[PDB]
Ligand binder design. Sequence first.
Ligand SMILES: CC(=O)SCCNC(=O)CCNC(=O)[C@H](O)C(C)(C)COP(=O)(O)OP(=O)(O)OC[C@H]1O[C@@H](n2cnc3c(N)ncnc32)[C@H](O)[C@@H]1OP(=O)(O)O
Ligand SMILES: CC(=O)SCCNC(=O)CCNC(=O)[C@H](O)C(C)(C)COP(=O)(O)OP(=O)(O)OC[C@H]1O[C@@H](n2cnc3c(N)ncnc32)[C@H](O)[C@@H]1OP(=O)(O)O
Ligand SMILES: CC(=O)SCCNC(=O)CCNC(=O)[C@H](O)C(C)(C)COP(=O)(O)OP(=O)(O)OC[C@H]1O[C@@H](n2cnc3c(N)ncnc32)[C@H](O)[C@@H]1OP(=O)(O)O
Ligand SMILES: [Ca+2]
Ligand SMILES: [Ca+2]
Ligand SMILES: [Ca+2]
Ligand SMILES: [Ca+2]
Ligand SMILES: [Zn+2]
Ligand SMILES: [Zn+2]
Ligand SMILES: [Zn+2]
Lengths: 453, 453, 453
Amino acid sequence: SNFAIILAAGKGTRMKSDLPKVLHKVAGISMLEHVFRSVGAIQPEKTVTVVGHKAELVEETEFVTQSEQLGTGHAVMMTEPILEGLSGHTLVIAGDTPLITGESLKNLIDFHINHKNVATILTAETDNPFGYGRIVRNDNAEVLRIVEQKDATDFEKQIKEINTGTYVFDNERLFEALKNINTNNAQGEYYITDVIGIFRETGEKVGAYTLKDFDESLGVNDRVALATAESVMRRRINHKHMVNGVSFVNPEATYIDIDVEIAPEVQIEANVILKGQTKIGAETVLTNGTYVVDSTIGAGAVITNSMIEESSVADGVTVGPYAHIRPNSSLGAQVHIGNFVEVKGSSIGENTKAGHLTYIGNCEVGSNVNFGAGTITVNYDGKNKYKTVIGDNVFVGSNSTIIAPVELGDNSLVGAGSTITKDVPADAIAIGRGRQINKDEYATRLPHHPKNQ
Amino acid sequence: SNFAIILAAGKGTRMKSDLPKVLHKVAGISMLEHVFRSVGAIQPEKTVTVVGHKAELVEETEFVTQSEQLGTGHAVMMTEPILEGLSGHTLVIAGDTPLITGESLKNLIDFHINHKNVATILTAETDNPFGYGRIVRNDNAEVLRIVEQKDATDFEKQIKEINTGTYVFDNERLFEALKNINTNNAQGEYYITDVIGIFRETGEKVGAYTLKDFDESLGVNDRVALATAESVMRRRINHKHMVNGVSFVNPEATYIDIDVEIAPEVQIEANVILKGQTKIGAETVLTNGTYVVDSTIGAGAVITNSMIEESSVADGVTVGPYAHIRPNSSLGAQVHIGNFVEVKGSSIGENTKAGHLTYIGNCEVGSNVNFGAGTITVNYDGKNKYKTVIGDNVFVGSNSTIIAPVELGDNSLVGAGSTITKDVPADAIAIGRGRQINKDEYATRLPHHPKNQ
Amino acid sequence: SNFAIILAAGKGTRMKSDLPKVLHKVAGISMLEHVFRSVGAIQPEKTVTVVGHKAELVEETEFVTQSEQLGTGHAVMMTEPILEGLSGHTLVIAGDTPLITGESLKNLIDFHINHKNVATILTAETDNPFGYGRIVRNDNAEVLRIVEQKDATDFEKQIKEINTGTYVFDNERLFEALKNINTNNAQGEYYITDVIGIFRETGEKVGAYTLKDFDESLGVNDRVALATAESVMRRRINHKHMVNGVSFVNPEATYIDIDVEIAPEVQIEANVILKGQTKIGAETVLTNGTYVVDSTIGAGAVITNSMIEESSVADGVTVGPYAHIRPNSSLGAQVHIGNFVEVKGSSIGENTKAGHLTYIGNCEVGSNVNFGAGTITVNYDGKNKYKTVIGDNVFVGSNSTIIAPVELGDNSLVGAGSTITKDVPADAIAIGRGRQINKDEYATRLPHHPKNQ
Ligand SMILES: CC(=O)SCCNC(=O)CCNC(=O)[C@H](O)C(C)(C)COP(=O)(O)OP(=O)(O)OC[C@H]1O[C@@H](n2cnc3c(N)ncnc32)[C@H](O)[C@@H]1OP(=O)(O)O
Ligand SMILES: CC(=O)SCCNC(=O)CCNC(=O)[C@H](O)C(C)(C)COP(=O)(O)OP(=O)(O)OC[C@H]1O[C@@H](n2cnc3c(N)ncnc32)[C@H](O)[C@@H]1OP(=O)(O)O
Ligand SMILES: CC(=O)SCCNC(=O)CCNC(=O)[C@H](O)C(C)(C)COP(=O)(O)OP(=O)(O)OC[C@H]1O[C@@H](n2cnc3c(N)ncnc32)[C@H](O)[C@@H]1OP(=O)(O)O
Ligand SMILES: [Ca+2]
Ligand SMILES: [Ca+2]
Ligand SMILES: [Ca+2]
Ligand SMILES: [Ca+2]
Ligand SMILES: [Zn+2]
Ligand SMILES: [Zn+2]
Ligand SMILES: [Zn+2]
């Protein structure tokens, strides 16, 4: 009953990009993927995407290639093999209108079914319709035709209802009308709007469903329009989170990707970034500058101005300010990671604290461990990485240098300032540092001394 | 002459919160506290706040409890014991309209006094009055009644003047009208708007004072409206600071709490956060990402992308970028705290420099001290914290580990890379590190060496 | 044919500033410099700037001083010596209207030439013209006069076309009309608008060119208007970059100075700051919080939440998060600078890595060097700075302390935790640290041990 054609071969010159236009991201997914999601709401039996140059990349729906730019008519014709003969209602939508909703496309197909139209145009009203196709209606307010700006009479220029370039067609007629135009065109290019002209010649019924919101119809041709799309999608996402019980200091300046999940009672300061497959648990606090990519954060956590990537963070964890949790990290329940701390490829057990100026790389760390300020786990020799194992209740002295592969046994202490080259037994202390020597009056000889300035 | 009732027991379902609705913060204080401040402008002899569930928490004005949700009429009746019999003008205001100003409530009470009204409604005009109570006026433009959306005739739906749910009543009549409705209601619930209906029955004079600004009347029911309130209050606060001589790169994206004080000639970049009892002195520069909580900052300071909490910062101080001044710190005149430095529970004397990768905790530090990059004050043994005392003109070597409790005497130098376990006399040097040994050609054996890749 | 007078002596009381008003910056240059750039579009033979108090500072165009505030008429008269007698069209513009474009001033002078006017007023339409001079036209819609608010009839108050205080005059008449007013004034002050009154007395032809955009005419009197000017100029700059192929997550919250150059295909997250003579190469990624001053960044770089000042960054470089590249640094091709790293006054050769918690100051560093986490180059003795030279393929051990002046030879390794006081030959290792000693069961005696809590 329902088919979908997505036009993804249109010109992208004004993007000034080596990336095909429809692959440019809005809130973490391509414009094309936003259109795939809205198209999904009509439950189409077949979906055909028409691509052009760099087809391989877009493919890397059913796909067909448009090798030559001969207009939207030729584009739609590239789906003839797959859709010719079939009965039911065929949506034609651009890959560069990512703000059109599933609700809008459901209401388009229903309106078309409703009025037994051969074609239905998705229209919208704007007070500045310059450049757009105008929807011409009669006394009875039925759709007669689409008039382009260049063809518009001064009276027609007054028309505020415009063509969004989104349509539903009776599938059978659509492929019949295109062949007609193609063969009798006396010209190379042809346009999906040419089919509306043919239906006018035959008196076949064409209708228009108007979007309440003109801004939903945005067709992205450049990075100005890309940023407008980002602004609308950001507002849409953040609105949903607020209705679901998430507080935002500033939802106009908080950057949350389309698939991020956020539990009720979360508080988000301005200028928080959440990306990819990120999940935030109940009552967690995210402060200004926090940046989370493809990570799970538990309940009752506080992430202060920190960057967390491809990692798991348990309930009650405190991170920051200015901490970096790098890929394949796990922070256990109630872990504290303080300022200027980097964790990479490491598991950290519950209640463990690394408060300051510390690097934990390729470590397996137990519960109730304390990392002194300035602790470095040394994991790399210039060719290979080595694992360090740290047991429960270990006290790693400030400014210590732990050279993997070593094991620090349960309850051990590393003396502050120590270089550790060998395993430390459970309940031992290890000390690897110079003994302090004091030299009376020697500072009087040195350039910092007041007596020497 | 003036009384005030604050309705703080209304439903909060759409907030999706375990915190009562009116306690949700806007610019650093509860919505209820914003209403207490606007109510203060009418100098009320008595102020009564009606609370519901979690009453203890809101209490933790005079307070009365509404154990049962029987409507705003029952809410106002919970103040009968305290206000019954008294003469003068009684403001009724919701705890969830935090944008209404003192100026607006002064102009409401004056307008009511003016026209010897028995009731005055605070009204506003909007082009989308759907859902609101409509204010019905006559040829003479006097207020006849309030008509709810569900009762509105199609002609009444056209009315753009709405009820904000803020009122002034002649106190005597108000408690008389409520008893009447309560006893003869033939129903459980009753509404403050029911009193306006009764005055219509008796021909008692009801007037309306219209807000110039409809957006001032916002009643917060969800976190969408909470963020709108934050946006308006942020704009209001930042406007006041700009008129008072504070420059903002972007006042729509700068987050300054309601009671923060900012001297003239301060320059604030976008995305600065100032919270609580914070004070900023003249000509100080705050750069993007700066976050200050409950701190005093002097004149001619430059805070670059740094977090400062419960601390005092003197004139001429430079902090950042990426520094953390933690609670109970004092930075003396012209102190420099550079990148990746944490100061906690420490006093730092004038002209002292800690430029890099340093932790200063539980230290008393003198004037003209230099902390080398990588210096750690070690203050914690896993149970107790210990104090370090550092004298004037001390040179603390890079990458040194100072294990409290020790004293570094005036003009002393700690050798770079030293572990310090013992006091250092004034004018001494202390060195606690291994002597360098060179091994010819040994690097040729190791995995980093080009010859081994 | 074209002359320009810039009025830069007007009152600045509402700025609450010791800096003269026109020197306040918008997007990295003074409001006066924005006006110099728009004035440049008319190719003036002579440009005269009238300054007042702190004249020296504005001077630190031709300049003339207005020692006494006797109005804009007296201001323009201070240019009589330089412009008296000359023929051609004289632009009069304020130093505090920085949003007026070159295109607008070209269209003003052309319109004036066009209609052989003796005067032309730059006008604009607003729905709130309160306080402004009204432009009075006739049936034929010719400009009769300028009427100030205080002189306006109720009919004249309705006029929405306002005086922006920008003009073109026939130079000869202008200086003749001013002398007339000055001598016969019976008063101290006189106004450029008084010249329009005189032309009305003589029937000399006065015309008005209307700005399409009223907001372009903003005259900055306070820091509220300064921030509005910042908002418009930020939008203008960011629009140009987007049309030129730069992606912005949020162009309303990205802070790019007027002369910053940005290659096509650059991606900029929200809350990026680019200042001064900054240049960004093709396909470079700048993430949230990045702050660049007077620096060149190559192609295919990724700057993650980092501050880069007066430095050069080659192609392929990765910086951050939370790195600080300080003045007179150079990062060679494919260099990696990781979290909590500071580079100052240092050259770093290609493919060199400093991933963590490192300070590199006054160093000459070769290619394929590895800095271990926690490495400190010690460059300062409290009086003088010293240079360290590091060769190619050097492996600088984690937590090492390199005390300048030393040279680390090609392919050398410094043992982790080492203090280095002496040169290290090429292909050597250097070790300067305590040997690890383990003490069985000693941790059982210490306060961290579970058995002691
Ligand atoms: C900034 C923050 O995050 S704060 C939190 C971090 N906290 C810390 O880093 C605190 C770490 N504390 C230390 O390093 C301490 O110096 C300890 C706990 C190592 C000192 O312990 P003490 O038992 O008081 O030291 P003490 O001088 O008694 O020495 C203990 C043993 O080690 C030996 N020893 C001491 N110093 C050295 C050395 N440099 N080399 C070899 N052996 C040594 C002693 O001879 C003694 O052995 P013995 O009993 O066989 O003779
Ligand atoms: C990154 C930044 O922030 S830069 C700013 C920070 N600046 C610094 O950290 C600079 C610190 N400078 C140092 O550590 C220096 O190495 C000093 C100043 C300690 C070196 O001083 P010098 O006097 O040149 O050292 P010198 O080798 O002469 O040794 C002085 C004394 O200490 C002794 N000594 C030297 N090294 C050691 C050691 N490892 N253990 C014990 N004693 C030692 C010497 O024997 C000599 O004593 P003696 O005269 O009784 O024989
Ligand atoms: C966190 C990150 O960024 S990870 C990346 C950073 N990576 C690093 O920092 C790794 C650095 N690695 C090291 O420091 C290592 O300990 C090395 C590579 C110094 C150890 O090398 P090895 O050759 O295994 O050490 P080994 O114990 O064999 O000692 C080598 C020589 O030095 C001597 N030596 C060892 N320790 C010391 C010492 N403390 N003092 C003096 N000499 C010493 C040995 O006696 C031997 O000499 P000899 O052959 O004449 O007797
Ligand atoms: Ca389009
Ligand atoms: Ca260190
Ligand atoms: Ca309400
Ligand atoms: Ca002005
Ligand atoms: Zn990262
Ligand atoms: Zn903090
Ligand atoms: Zn800097």
